[PDB]
């Protein structure tokens, strides 16, 4: 029964990095959107949200400040998240994963091209519209890494441990783009295996060591076809200057393989 101007807030869709997200339905027009509700940084997020115009990125409709509360209106994803399409221990059919991967690269290339890094790519932040088109959501941790054509290195630790690149734990400062590439590799592994490969990409983690020693006879790798696995070997490369860039992912064999379910 709460509402904001013309919109009713009809049900909880969940919680992003900060605040709650509600399904908002217009009393008059019946249009449904999503609204993020924040209490009591948000200037930055709004500035970034207003830049976004791409089919694989959630669009921002505008915002309203009432009291303590701030309302950020955004495109609704009626298909829910990618997380809900990944069957545990199985993943999803390779052709569906490939399609979602293409769309995730289109969104990330968009962001990077406007000098924005997302910093928390994972299946919970990758939403689906009614045609199962992927949309990258939640810009609460997003920031500028290129401005006036000059790159700025990042130094703040943020993200989600299983998805975070190893440099972010080991370096005082690091480049933004290879960190988002790495997390897209972990997404791809989740999609193809229904399991995350490691708790964190650190020296104390045995599963990460196993991967650096190429023990791909272990899970999750043994579930993945050699062709996508060859791509994962180029993405999940410890040294970020040696790691594959997006332009070269677009040249990969698996990426360009015709697939149908
Ligand atoms: C990251 C997140 C958490 C909770 C809900 C949502 C969300 C769910 C949905 N069905 N559509 C949405 N559109 C923008 C959302 C955001 N943020 C969003 C997204
Ligand atoms: Cl998973």
Swiss-Prot record:
This protein's encoding gene: CHEK1
Main location: nucleus
Biological source species: Homo sapiens (Human)
Result when mutating residue 122 to R: Strong reduction of chromatin-associated CHK1 ubiquitination
Summary of the function given for this chain in its UniProt record: Serine/threonine-protein kinase which is required for checkpoint-mediated cell cycle arrest and activation of DNA repair in response to the presence of DNA damage or unreplicated DNA. May also negatively regulate cell cycle progression during unperturbed cell cycles. This regulation is achieved by a number of mechanisms that together help to preserve the integrity of the genome. Recognizes the substrate consensus sequence [R-X-X-S/T]. Binds to and phosphorylates CDC25A, CDC25B and CDC25C.
Keywords recorded for this protein, A-Z: ATP-binding, Cell cycle, Chromosome, Cytoplasm, Cytoskeleton, Disease variant, DNA damage, DNA repair, Isopeptide bond, Kinase, Nucleotide-binding, Nucleus, Phosphoprotein, Serine/threonine-protein kinase, Transferase, Ubl conjugation
Active-site residues per Swiss-Prot or TrEMBL entry: 120 (proton acceptor)
Subcellular location: Nucleus; Chromosome; Cytoplasm; Cytoplasm, Cytoskeleton, Microtubule organizing center, Centrosome
Domains (record comment): The autoinhibitory region (AIR) inhibits the activity of the kinase domain.
E.C. code: 2.7.11.1
Entry protein name: Serine/threonine-protein kinase Chk1
Similarity section: Belongs to the protein kinase superfamily. CAMK Ser/Thr protein kinase family. NIM1 subfamily.
